[PDB]
């Protein structure tokens, strides 16, 4: 019940400054007891594929923290992550590919299709995602 | 806590609502609506996707429409989020091919119901087409889906899905054109003629948006029907055995032979014998698609009752250009001015390769019939005509048979070429009678007539000028300011064979 | 059991002007590494990966296809037998993939495997050689991922 | 004899016999003659031309040959008599289902494949009307045909009324009031709303019924006045009407919002004029939104009534009605988008003009936009715009009174002196839909972005660059905020209409400045496809300049694509062989080196490739290079009328291949 203004700002906020301020407030408030991050799953999924850089980075960090606190929610970020890898902007796909190792370690059940789409984007799209998938395969043994 | 606990069962709740029971479905739908109004994320996109993903009868679509009408008074912005969530689930492992096919066909039905009508989509502002037009980048890769159901559903959806306020993006436009031509070719391969309506409609709708899109559509359609693949659809195309029979049957001397040269006895030796029927109908469908693409709109009831739409000169010019680029990419003699006859003795290899390309794929001739419709279009596709005429001249010069019927394909190609270059507003009807009387003419006589054709085309060259526009219609009329010596040669050829071409004289 | 000695002439079999000898050497080394695990085997496998990577830029398309069609399961088995090679192989694969990404876009095709980037694997005929090479690369990467993850 | 005697009917009757004994060449010749005579002006019985075309088509399909293009050109838009004559000719051949055994299959196939088009079902019914079909189409099979014809264009009926499962007359009070308020929430028509509200007020005590939905968010600017009414019925009615109208305007439901606002205004006519003016302003905003989005984005000209209404409303400002900040920027954007530059700052310049920043910025922008046809070197309004823009996006306190970090303009949102904030201008530009205004703002921002912002000298050039280069107080400005806002403006102006080569080139330059080469090449190819039609023609010299090609070479060089670099080094006015030889020397290319040699028309590059392949012992590619050199198209001795055409063709092919590669 105490998270009403934050949700209202995340839903009614349209400018970059308000969303950035709300995300920074949530990040600084989630230092200890990150269970509250489980109450902003939909907002983080919507702000994950954002055109901004700082807001997208904060959303990715919050999502990774929430998945590390409770891995059971790691299966809920499957579609919204794939949309980050299949976008025609070249901006969010870079952050998605950088966070690919941690998300693949936290998933442990859908890492195959994640790495498959990563290699497909790296082959068709002009880039070199060698180190990321290498670290993913080394950690997954 | 009741709604907070029921929020984690929206899937099974929608599954029970879609059972179409007596009274339980109404109460469950009201519960779904109250749960969507209560919670802050509103569960709008998720519930709408769960409803539209497993809908088979129009009752489920009506229930979804009622839910949206009940939620639109309290919430806002449900279609974009629902479509985004559904597409993100489709691109992921969720939403199995049957589920996504059902969702796509339900979305297509909703768009179709929103397009027509004056009371349904008017009393309930939803904008299905406007909300679906913002997802053409995600709906494009679904046209080439390996599952036929999902591909057909996406084709039926994109055939009626409108475009956004902006025209289109070049990347999105090229992707849509490629996906559409791939779906058209795949449906012609699998379904055939009666299963291409969606692809033709989509291509005709997106080709009339911009000249660049039309040119890209025409180029890709021409290049796809002439590639090594999909060309048989329109026109057509180790030691044990060596040890059991060794030692030369003597076990004391060497082998009888001295080795092999290559391999010998080529295994494949396959000949094109697919089918005769149902092959020309694919060409008919392709020509109908091309006509729908080039014909400018179109549909204003011209004339009194026999309005015939003209062909756009730019579209036919692009078709001729891509045809020339596909047949012979050479440019050593691509000038519009016809060189002299002796000049044809140096580029015999190009003419022979053009003749081979024409004999391997007859569809090219049909494509010429599309270029000969527009008057100024055939003036650009002159390299193909020149090469074909030179090849025919070289064949008739080295023909020992006294009758033309010994070479049927060459005579057919000669008549077809002359008819094409005559109906393209380039030759008088005397040439139309010449290719008619070609049926029973001597080989050297046909060669001399084609040489007179070459001379006339060298004198009166096909050029973009001398095709002034008319204030009546869009047709380009060519006013001949005809050939004296050419008509004299034709009359002499006709008079030397009066004993068989007597009735053909009175026609001209 | 006397096949390990073949390692002692596996590099000599690689330095041959015939592509068939090189392909056979790569496959034999792949089988020897999936059977025997030795530091010498790892060194010879690394040398094979290097000589396969340096052959991508000195072979034409008609030869690149015939040389990289049979030798991809060799890389799969090299990954299955030698974990530390993973990155290298991946990089190599990426390179080859990008090469194919430039070979398909050169000439017009019939299936257009470029838009197929947003596709998933489905468990479990006559086409274009470049498209066949792309599909083989994708399949071998899928098998490598499934082996490493499971 | 009939054709020469100007008797087309006799010729049509003689040609419609299909005796199977006639030269098809003569028939095609007379058909082309009739077509040429009908298309050359003064058509002579074009109906007979269509008739003989139909006879030729049916003869061709009965003999077993392809269908000509004239049949499609004529049947693109058929009608009743056309299909009637087609069916009459199709049923008047020789040996009518007596001893043919072969023409029946061709007839069936033609009748099956002729219904592929004909989107109108009336034509299909007319086809299936004569004898219920022609030759019955192998009856017991047309079921799937009519099924697919009906499924091609289906039509279903859905419901709009919500699920009102509550039974009437519940013989109670609580459930009755619940059903009544549920119907009120689900009600849109103002008459039903008023009836339900007056019934609730009559059946219950003096309790308020406006707080029955937490989704009706009324702004606090009008909330203090909407509650200052003695009678509860009137205030409840006006509150519900205003809330529903605002919600409908948010959901783009102007069809009901107009009626709601009209009913509310009619009810307020008897009340105080304060709420009357409030509802008038709300109706003005709704009409602006409708004219901007409802009537269509391709508007031609407003009816000059709402324009005069907005002008008067902005000019009077007599009463003390609380103005909303959104309405001001909305009407300013409405006046700026419809090319109202005639209303400059010279009119009403001091009567509360400097107070509202929206109108001030709009007037200054309209004044600085019309200075382009003013070739005099004055640019005073441009200087004022540049100064106010650099002063808005700068920190007010250079001593960092807030904290030690640099979160003043990014997080604190303060220290943004001027007329507006850094985010209000974003919302103001997002309401602007005008190519000239948008490109002027984008040029201003991109000029303010490349002024000593980094060390590298990758200055992204622009067409309209007349802004002053002197930057006062280069430390108070925020380069990060400028980059963020210029990226947002580029994204917005690309979402408006991506068919603009200048904005695509600007986006590609911005991506290249941020070490994004793949997206830079993507947007470069996009601009190339915008200017020239999918590279079918030569690109204009101003769209693809030397700098653009050099940036493409820089992008492809660091992208491990060296053969693409060598090919792109030929698009310049002077071929730079140094960078081409430097790129071709690498051995880590990712661009199918042996597959791009056909796009090279330069003898020097091919000679260097042959030398490099011979030096490294690569005979397989050396032979390909020699074979490419030995082509007749390129000889370095042509009269230049052949080399240019081959070069243009190779340019088109390479650009199309690169466009198929990316995006």
Query: HSE on the CB side for D598, CA within 13 Å?
Result: 13
- Per CB-CB distance under 8 Å, the chain A contacts of C101 are 123-124, 126
Tell me if residue B246 falls in helix, strand or coil.
coil
Q: Select from A115, A124, A130 the Cβ nearest to the Cβ of C114.
A: A124
What CA–CA distance (Å, rounded) separates D332 from D285? Answer: 11
Residue (of D598, D505, D595) closest to D543 by Cα position: D505
CB-based contact D104:D61 (threshold 8 Å):
no
Chains touching chain C at 3 or more Cβ pairs under 8 angstroms? Answer: A, B, D
Q: Select from C115, C126, C128 the Cβ nearest to the Cβ of B178.
A: C115
**Distance from chain centroid for Cα D607:** 47
CB-based contact A114:C132 (threshold 8 Å):
no
Q: Select from D76, D154, D522 the Cβ nearest to the Cβ of B112.
A: D154
First to last CA, chain B: 96
Tell me how close the Cα of D515 comes to any Cα of chain A, in angstroms.
11
Q: Within 10 A of C91 (CB to CB), how many other CB atoms are there?
A: 18
What DSSP assignment string belongs to A88-123? Answer: TTSSHHHHHHHHHHHHHHHHSSSHHHHHHHHHHHHH
What CA–CA distance (Å, rounded) separates B389 from B462? Answer: 15
**Distance from chain centroid for Cα B307:** 25
- Per CB-CB distance under 8 Å, the chain D contacts of B58 are 156-158
What CA–CA distance (Å, rounded) separates B355 from B358? Answer: 5
Whether a cis peptide bond, with omega within 30° of 0, leads into B298 is yes
Do the Cβ atoms of A90 and D423 come within 8 Å? no
What CA–CA distance (Å, rounded) separates B43 from B37? Answer: 9
C-alpha separations of D659 from B170, B434, C123, D364, D397 in Å = 10, 47, 33, 42, 49
Interhelix angle D435-449/D501-513, nearest 10 degrees = 20
Shortest CA distance from B310: residue in chain D: D73
Residue (of D562, D563, D488, D550) closest to D524 by Cα position: D550
What CA–CA distance (Å, rounded) separates C76 from C71? Answer: 9
C-alpha separations of D17 from A112, D46, D55 in Å = 70, 20, 9
Shortest CA distance from B77: residue in chain A: A11
What CA–CA distance (Å, rounded) separates B208 from A83? Answer: 31
What CA–CA distance (Å, rounded) separates C120 from B64? Answer: 30
B92 touches chain A (CB under 8 A): yes
Tell me how close the Cα of A128 comes to any Cα of chain C, in angstroms.
7
Percent of chain C as helix, strand, coil, to the nearest 5? 75, 0, 25
What CA–CA distance (Å, rounded) separates B447 from B394? Answer: 9
Do the Cβ atoms of B92 and A79 come within 8 Å? yes
- Per CB-CB distance under 8 Å, the chain B contacts of A96 are none
Choose the mutation target among A1, A9, A17, A23 for the interface with D, i.e. most D CBs under 10 Å: A17
B199 touches chain D (CB under 8 A): no
- Per CB-CB distance under 8 Å, the chain B contacts of A1 are none
Asked how this structure was determined, the answer is cryo-EM
Query: HSE on the CB side for C126, CA within 13 Å?
Result: 4
What CA–CA distance (Å, rounded) separates B285 from B287? Answer: 5
CB-based contact B297:B214 (threshold 8 Å):
no
CB-based contact D41:B472 (threshold 8 Å):
yes
Count Cβ atoms within 10 A of the Cβ of residue D171 and give its class: 0-12 exposed, 13-18 middle, 19 or more buried.
exposed
What CA–CA distance (Å, rounded) separates D393 from D386? Answer: 11
Do the Cβ atoms of D592 and C106 come within 8 Å? yes
∠ CA(D141), CA(B203), CA(B137), 5° rounding?
A: 115
Do the Cβ atoms of C61 and D594 come within 8 Å? yes
Do the Cβ atoms of D411 and A20 come within 8 Å? yes
Give D584-653 as a 3 state SS string.
HCCCCCCCCHHHCHHHCCCHHHHHHHHHHHHHCCCHHHHHHHHHHHCCCCCCCCCCCCCHHHHHHHHHHH
CA dihedral B34, B40, B46, B52 (to 10 degrees): 40
What CA–CA distance (Å, rounded) separates B407 from D78? Answer: 40
Facing residues of B295 across strands? B311
Looking up tokens 């059972």 gives B19
First to last CA, chain C: 29
What CA–CA distance (Å, rounded) separates D166 from B40? Answer: 26
- Per CB-CB distance under 8 Å, the chain A contacts of D511 are 90
Give me C66's structure tokens.
């015939």
Spatial CB neighbours of D595, under 8 Å, sequence gap ≥ 6: C61, C102, C103, C106
- Per CB-CB distance under 8 Å, the chain D contacts of C63 are 620
CB-based contact D251:B72 (threshold 8 Å):
yes
Interhelix angle B24-38/B44-53, nearest 10 degrees = 150
CB-based contact D431:D333 (threshold 8 Å):
yes
CB-based contact D115:D157 (threshold 8 Å):
no
Count Cβ atoms within 10 A of the Cβ of residue D444 and give its class: 0-12 exposed, 13-18 middle, 19 or more buried.
buried
Residue (of B493, B355, B393) closest to B434 by Cα position: B493
Give me B4's structure tokens.
């907070």
What DSSP assignment string belongs to D501-549? Answer: HHHHHHHHHHHHHTT-HHHHHHHHHHHHHHHTGGGSSPPPTTTS-HHHH
What CA–CA distance (Å, rounded) separates A120 from A128? Answer: 11
Q: Within 10 A of B251 (CB to CB), how many other CB atoms are there?
A: 7
Question: What's the farthest any 2 CA atoms get from each other in chain D?
Answer: 105
Choose the mutation target among B42, B127, B212, B326 for the interface with D, i.e. most D CBs under 10 Å: B212
D623 touches chain A (CB under 8 A): no
Q: Within 10 A of D97 (CB to CB), how many other CB atoms are there?
A: 14
- Strand (E) or helix (H) holding D191: helix D190-203
What CA–CA distance (Å, rounded) separates D425 from A59? Answer: 25
Give D75-93 as a 3 state SS string.
HCCCCHHHHHHHHHHHCCC
**Distance from chain centroid for Cα B220:** 8
CB-based contact B293:B218 (threshold 8 Å):
yes
- Per CB-CB distance under 8 Å, the chain A contacts of B87 are 83
Do the Cβ atoms of A126 and D484 come within 8 Å? no
What DSSP assignment string belongs to D9-30? Answer: HHHHHHHTS--S-S-HHHHHHH
D534 touches chain B (CB under 8 A): yes
Residue (of B226, B228, B223, B220) closest to B175 by Cα position: B220
Characterise B210 by phi-psi region: left (phi > 0), alpha (psi -120 to 50), beta (else). Answer: beta
Give me D594's structure tokens.
């042996």
**Chains A–C, number of C-beta pairs less than 8 Å apart:** 73
- Per CB-CB distance under 8 Å, the chain D contacts of A11 are none
Residue D394: phi, psi to the nearest 5? Answer: -120, 155
What CA–CA distance (Å, rounded) separates A65 from A29? Answer: 13
For B505, which DSSP code? T
Tell me how close the Cα of C115 comes to any Cα of chain B, in angstroms.
6
What CA–CA distance (Å, rounded) separates A128 from A122? Answer: 6
Spatial CB neighbours of D409, under 8 Å, sequence gap ≥ 6: D393, D395, D415, D416, D422, D478, D481
What CA–CA distance (Å, rounded) separates B71 from A12? Answer: 18
What CA–CA distance (Å, rounded) separates D342 from D311? Answer: 13
- Per CB-CB distance under 8 Å, the chain B contacts of C120 are 93
What CA–CA distance (Å, rounded) separates B68 from B48? Answer: 8
Do the Cβ atoms of C116 and B182 come within 8 Å? no
Give me B128's structure tokens.
């299905």
What CA–CA distance (Å, rounded) separates C7 from C28? Answer: 9
What CA–CA distance (Å, rounded) separates D313 from B382? Answer: 67
**Chains B–C, number of C-beta pairs less than 8 Å apart:** 39
Segment 27-86 of chain D within 8 Å of chain B by CB: 28-29, 32-33, 35-36, 39-41, 46-47, 50, 64-70, 72-74, 76-77, 79, 81-82
**Distance from chain centroid for Cα D202:** 53
Alpha helices, DSSP H only, in chain A?
A: 4-12, 16-29, 41-48, 54-69, 78-85, 92-107, 111-124, 130-140
Which string of b and e fits D335-350 if b means at least 16 CB within 10 Å?
Answer: bbbbebeebeeeeeee
Query: HSE on the CB side for D296, CA within 13 Å?
Result: 5
CB-based contact D468:D386 (threshold 8 Å):
yes
Which string of b and e fits B178-207 if b means at least 16 CB within 10 Å?
Answer: bbbbbbbbbbbeeeebbbbbbbbbbbbbbb
CB-based contact C143:C76 (threshold 8 Å):
yes
Own/partner pairs, D373-381, CB within 8 angstroms, 24+ separation: D379/D466
Taking the alpha carbons of D561, B144, B199, B195 in that order, is the dihedral positive or negative? positive
Look at chain A and count its residues. Answer: 141
Interhelix angle B10-17/B24-38, nearest 10 degrees = 150
CB-based contact A93:A84 (threshold 8 Å):
yes
Give me C18's structure tokens.
């015939």
∠ CA(B388), CA(B389), CA(B391), 5° rounding?
A: 65
Q: Select from D158, D497, D663 the Cβ nearest to the Cβ of B61.
A: D158
Tell me how close the Cα of C130 comes to any Cα of chain B, in angstroms.
13
**Chains C–D, number of C-beta pairs less than 8 Å apart:** 50
Whether a cis peptide bond, with omega within 30° of 0, leads into C3 is no
Tell me if residue D364 falls in helix, strand or coil.
helix
CB-based contact D620:D597 (threshold 8 Å):
no
For B389, which DSSP code? H
Choose the mutation target among D160, D507, D633 for the interface with B, i.e. most B CBs under 10 Å: D160
- Per CB-CB distance under 8 Å, the chain A contacts of D559 are 126
Which string of b and e fits D100-137 if b means at least 16 CB within 10 Å?
Answer: eeebeebbbbbbbbbbbbbeeeebbebbbeeeebbbeb
Tell me if residue B63 falls in helix, strand or coil.
helix
């Amino acid at each position: 019940a105490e998270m009403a203004p934050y949700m209202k700002r995340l839903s009614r906020g349209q400018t970059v400054e308000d969303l950035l301020e709300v995300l920074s407030d949530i990040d600084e408030m989630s230092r200890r007891r990150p269970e509250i991050l489980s109450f902003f799953s939909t907002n983080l999924q919507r702000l994950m594929s954002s055109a901004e850089e700082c807001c997208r980075n904060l959303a990715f960090s919050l999502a990774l923290r929430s998945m590390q606190n409770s891995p059971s929610i790691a299966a809920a970020f499957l579609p919204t992550f794939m949309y980050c890898l299949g976008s025609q902007d070249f901006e969010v796909v870079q952050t998605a590919l950088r966070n690919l190792p941690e998300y693949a370690l936290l998933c442990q059940e859908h890492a195959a299709v994640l790495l498959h789409r990563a290699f497909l984007v790296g082959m068709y799209g002009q880039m070199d995602p060698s180190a990321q998938i290498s670290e993913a395969l080394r950690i997954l043994h | 806590p009741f709604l907070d606990a029921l929020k984690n069962h929206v899937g099974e709740l929608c599954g029970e609502t879609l059972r179409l029971e007596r009274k339980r479905f109404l109460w469950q739908h009201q519960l779904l609506g109250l749960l969507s109004v209560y919670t802050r994320p509103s569960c709008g996109p998720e519930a709408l996707g769960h409803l539209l993903s497993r809908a088979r009868s129009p009752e489920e679509l009506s229930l979804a429409t009622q839910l949206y009408a009940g939620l639109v008074v309290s919430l806002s912005g449900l279609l974009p989020l629902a479509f985004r969530s559904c597409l993100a689930r489709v691109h992921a492992g969720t939403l199995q091919p049957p589920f996504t096919a059902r969702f796509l066909r339900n979305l297509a039905l909703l768009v179709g119901w929103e397009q027509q009508g004056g009371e349904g989509p008017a009393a309930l502002g939803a904008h299905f087409g406007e909300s679906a037009s913002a997802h053409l980048s995600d709906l494009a890769p679904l046209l080439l889906h390996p599952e036929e159901e999902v591909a057909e559903a996406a084709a039926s959806l994109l055939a009626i899905c409108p475009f956004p306020s902006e025209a289109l993006s070049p990347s999105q436009l090229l992707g849509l054109v490629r996906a559409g031509v791939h779906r058209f070719f795949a449906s012609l391969r699998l379904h055939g003629p009666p299963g291409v309506a969606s692809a033709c409609q989509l291509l005709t709708r997106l080709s009339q948006t911009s000249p660049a899109g039309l040119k890209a559509v025409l180029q890709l359609l021409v290049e796809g029907a002439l590639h090594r693949g999909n060309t048989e659809l329109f026109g057509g195309q180790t030691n044990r055995r060596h040890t059991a029979a060794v030692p030369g049957p003597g076990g004391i001397w060497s082998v009888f032979h001295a080795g092999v040269i290559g391999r010998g006895l080529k295994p494949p030796k396959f000949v094109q014998s697919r089918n005769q029927q149902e092959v020309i109908y694919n060409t008919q469908s392709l020509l109908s698609l091309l006509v729908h693409c080039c014909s400018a709109p179109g549909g204003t009831e011209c004339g009194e009752c026999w309005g015939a739409p003209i062909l756009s000169p730019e579209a036919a010019k692009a078709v001729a250009v891509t045809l020339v680029e596909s047949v012979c990419p050479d440019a050593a003699g691509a000038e519009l001015a016809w060189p002299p006859e002796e000049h044809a003795r140096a580029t015999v290899e190009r003419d022979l390769r053009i003749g081979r390309r024409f004999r391997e794929q007859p569809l090219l001739f049909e494509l010429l019939k599309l270029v000969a419709a527009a008057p100024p279009a055939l003036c650009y596709c002159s390299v193909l005509l020149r090469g074909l005429l030179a090849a025919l001249l070289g064949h008739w010069e080295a023909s020992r048979h006294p009758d033309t019927t010994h070479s049927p394909w060459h005579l057919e190609a000669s008549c077809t070429l002359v008819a094409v270059m005559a109906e393209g507003s380039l030759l008088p009807p005397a040439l139309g009678n010449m290719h008619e009387v070609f049926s029973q003419l001597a080989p050297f006589e046909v060669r001399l007539l084609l040489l007179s054709v070459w001379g006339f085309l060298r004198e009166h060259g096909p050029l973009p000028q001398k095709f002034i526009f008319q204030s009546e219609r869009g047709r380009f009329i060519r006013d001949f300011s005809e050939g004296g010596p050419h008509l004299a040669v034709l009359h002499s050829v006709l008079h030397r064979n009066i004993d068989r071409l007597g009735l053909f004289s009175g026609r001209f | 059991p006397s096949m390990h000695i073949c390692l002692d002439f596996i590099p000599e079999l690689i330095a041959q002007p015939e592509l068939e000898k090189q392909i056979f050497a790569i496959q034999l080394l792949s089988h020897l590494c999936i059977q025997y695990a030795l530091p010498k085997s790892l060194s010879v496998a690394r040398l094979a990966v290097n000589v396969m990577g340096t052959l991508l830029t000195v072979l034409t398309q008609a030869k690149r296809y015939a040389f990289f069609m049979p030798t991809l399961p060799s890389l799969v088995s090299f990954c299955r037998a030698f974990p530390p090679l993973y990155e290298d192989i991946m990089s190599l694969l990426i390179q080859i993939g990008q090469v194919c990404a430039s070979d398909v876009a050169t000439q017009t095709r019939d299936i257009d495997p470029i838009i197929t980037r947003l596709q998933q694997i489905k468990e479990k005929g006559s086409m274009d050689p470049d498209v066949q090479l792309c599909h083989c690369i994708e399949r071998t990467v899928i098998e490598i991922i499934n082996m490493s993850v499971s | 004899l009939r054709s020469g005697n100007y008797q087309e009917v006799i010729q049509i009757f003689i040609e419609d016999n299909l005796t199977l004994s006639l030269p098809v060449q003569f028939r095609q010749s007379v058909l082309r003659e009739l077509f040429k005579k009908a298309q050359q002006g003064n058509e002579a019985l074009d109906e007979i031309c269509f008739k003989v075309c139909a006879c030729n088509t049916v003869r061709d399909i009965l003999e077993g040959r392809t269908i000509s293009v004239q049949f499609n050109q004529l049947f693109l838009r058929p009608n009743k008599e056309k299909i009637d004559f087609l069916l009459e000719v199709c049923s008047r051949s020789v040996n009518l289902e007596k001893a043919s055994e072969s023409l029946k299959g061709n007839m069936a196939a033609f009748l099956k494949n002729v219904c592929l088009g004909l989107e109108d079902l009336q034509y299909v019914f007319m086809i299936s009307s004569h004898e219920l079909f022609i030759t019955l189409l192998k009856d017991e099979e047309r079921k799937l045909l009519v099924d697919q014809m009906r499924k091609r264009s289906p039509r279903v009926n859905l419901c709009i009324k919500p699920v009102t499962s509550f039974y009437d007359i519940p013989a109670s009070a609580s459930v009755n009031i619940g059903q009544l308020e549920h119907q009120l929430i689900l009600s849109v028509d103002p008459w039903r709303i008023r009836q339900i509200l007056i019934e609730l007020h009559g059946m219950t005590s003096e309790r308020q019924f406006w707080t029955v939905s937490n989704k009706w968010e009324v702004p606090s600017v009008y909330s203090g006045v909407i509650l200052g009414i003695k009678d509860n019925l009137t205030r409840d009615l006006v509150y519900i009407l205003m809330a529903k109208g605002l919600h409908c305007s948010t959901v783009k439901d102007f069809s009901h919002a107009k009626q709601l606002f009209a009913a509310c205004l009619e009810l307020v006519t008897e009340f105080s004029p304060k709420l009357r003016q409030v509802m008038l302003n709300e109706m003005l905003l709704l009409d602006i939104h409708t004219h901007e989005a409802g009537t269509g984005q391709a508007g031609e000209r407003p009816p000059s009534d709402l324009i005069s209404r907005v002008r008067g409303y902005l000019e009077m400002r007599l009463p003390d009605i609380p103005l909303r900040q959104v309405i001001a920027e909305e009407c300013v954007a409405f006046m700026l988008n419809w090319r109202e530059n005639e209303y400059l700052t010279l009119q009403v310049p001091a009567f509360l003009l400097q107070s509202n920043p929206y109108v001030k910025l709009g007037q200054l922008l309209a004044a600085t936009c019309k200075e382009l046809p003013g070739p005099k070197e004055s640019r005073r309004t441009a200087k004022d715009l540049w100064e106010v823009v650099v002063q808005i996006c700068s920190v007010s306190s250079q001593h960092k009174r807030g904290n030690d970090g640099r979160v003043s303009l990014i997080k604190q949102r303060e220290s943004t002196l001027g007329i507006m904030y850094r985010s209000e201008l974003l919302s103001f530009i997002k309401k602007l839909r005008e190519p000239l205004v948008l490109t002027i703002i984008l040029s201003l921002f991109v000029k303010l972005h490349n002024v000593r912002e980094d060390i590298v000298n990758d200055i992204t050039a622009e067409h309209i660059s007349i802004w002053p280069s002197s930057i006062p107080n280069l430390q108070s400005v925020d380069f990060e905020a400028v980059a963020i806002t210029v990226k947002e403006l580029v994204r917005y102006t690309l979402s408006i209409n991506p068919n603009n080569h200048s904005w695509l080139i600007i986006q590609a330059d911005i991506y290249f400045a941020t070490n994004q080469y793949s997206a830079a090449l993507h947007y470069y190819l996009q601009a190339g496809a915008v200017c020239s039609d999918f590279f079918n023609k030569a690109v204009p010299p101003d769209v693809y300049t030397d700098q653009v090609i050099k940036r493409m070479i820089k992008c492809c060089s660091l992208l491990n694509c060296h053969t693409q670099v060598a090919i792109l080094c030929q698009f310049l006015r002077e071929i730079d062989y140094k960078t081409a030889f430097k790129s071709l020397q690498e051995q880590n290319s990712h661009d199918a080196m042996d597959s791009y040699y056909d796009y090279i028309w330069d003898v020097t590059i091919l000679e260097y490739l042959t030398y490099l392949h011979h030096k490294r012992g690569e005979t397989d590619k050396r032979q390909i290079a020699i074979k490419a050199i030995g082509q007749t198209e390129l000889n370095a001795s042509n009269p230049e009328e052949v080399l240019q055409l081959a070069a243009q063709r190779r340019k088109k092919k390479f650009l199309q291949a690169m466009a198929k590669l990316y995006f």
